[PDB]
Design a protein around this ligand. Sequence first.
Ligand code: GTR
Ligand code: MG
Length: 356
Amino acid sequence: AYTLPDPLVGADGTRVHDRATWQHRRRPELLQLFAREVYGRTPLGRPEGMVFKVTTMEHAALGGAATRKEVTVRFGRDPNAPSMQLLLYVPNAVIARAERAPVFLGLNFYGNHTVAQKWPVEQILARGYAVATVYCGDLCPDRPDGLNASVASWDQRAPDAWGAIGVWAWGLSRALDYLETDPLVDASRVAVHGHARLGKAALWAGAQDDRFALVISNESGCGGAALSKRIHGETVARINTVFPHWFARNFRRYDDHEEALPVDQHELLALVAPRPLYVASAEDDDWADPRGEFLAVKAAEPVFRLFGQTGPSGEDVPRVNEPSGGALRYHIRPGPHGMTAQDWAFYLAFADEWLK
Ligand SMILES: O=C(O)[C@H]1O[C@@H](O)[C@H](O)[C@@H](O)[C@H]1O
Ligand SMILES: [Mg+2]
C-alpha cells in the first residue's frame, strides 16, 4: 500500500500550523518514530572521556594547497579505548585570510586514504571548502555480525536497538564534536554528506543532529530518501534480508508490509528543515528509486515552506543536470549509481549559496 502520512498532522491529529509547534512537538514525534520503527534508538550522545589526538599535521599537503590533519577520536580516556580516525584537508588560502573554513564531512566506504572511491578533494579545496572523512568500518564493520565489533558492542539486541546506519550516523556527529575544537574549521558551517548506504547515515545524522548546517543525500535510496511506500527498486524486505545489521530489528515488521509504516522518508527529510537539504538521484539508478526520491522531497516541501523555504518547482522529476529548488534542492544526473564530479559540482554551488 501507499498513502503517505502527513508531516504536518501530529500523532493526536492536530494540524501543525506554526514553526514552534513543529520544532518542539512534531519533530520529537517523528524522531522517535524513526528511531523506534526504522533505524533504532541512538543510545549514546557525546561519551565522556572522548579524547582527540592530532597525530599528523602537514602544512603543505597537495603542493602547499592544503593543510592535512590526522586525528584519532578516542571514545574513552584509556589510551587503548575504541577509536576512529578522522582525516581533514583544509585549504591554505582560507587559513591565510584568517577565516575558519566551512567543511564537507562524509563517511567513506574503503578507508580514509582511498578518497577506489575518490571525491574531488582538490576541487572542493580549490573552491574554498575543507573536507573531513571517517572510514565507516571504524564505527561498524559492514557485515551482518558487524555490530559485535562496533562502537555499539562496547541473546540478541533489542528490537528498537540501532544498527549500522545509526552507528555510522553517530560517528558523523562525533566527527562534528572534533570539528568544533579545531580552529581551522567552522563547525557551524558543516555540510554532512553521504553516498548510498552512507547517505542513509548522512540523512539520519542530519535529522537527529541539528548542528549540521547542510545535509546532502547522494542516491541513498531505500531507507534513505526514497519513499518506502512506493515499492520500487529496492524494497524493505530486500534491504533487511541482504543487510540485516543496517536497520533496527523493528524495521523488519515492514517487510513486504510498507502499508503499515507509520512514517515514510519524506518525514526524515522534513526533519532537516529549516536547514538546507539536497537530495540527488542517478537516471539509471532504478534500485534507489529516483522518482521516489524526488517525490519524498516534494512531500517534505510543506515543512520547508512553513519556514518560508522552497523546494523543486514542478511536480515531477526535473530534466537531467538541471538542479531545482531553493534551500530544498534536487537534481538527477545521467548514468548509473555512484557519486561523480557532476554531482559534486552541483553540491558545491549549493554550498556556495548557503554556507558562503
Ligand atoms: O551502492 C551500494 O552498494 C548500496 O546502495 C544502497 O543505497 C543500497 O541500499 C544497497 O542495496 C546497495 O546497492
Ligand atoms: Mg524502493
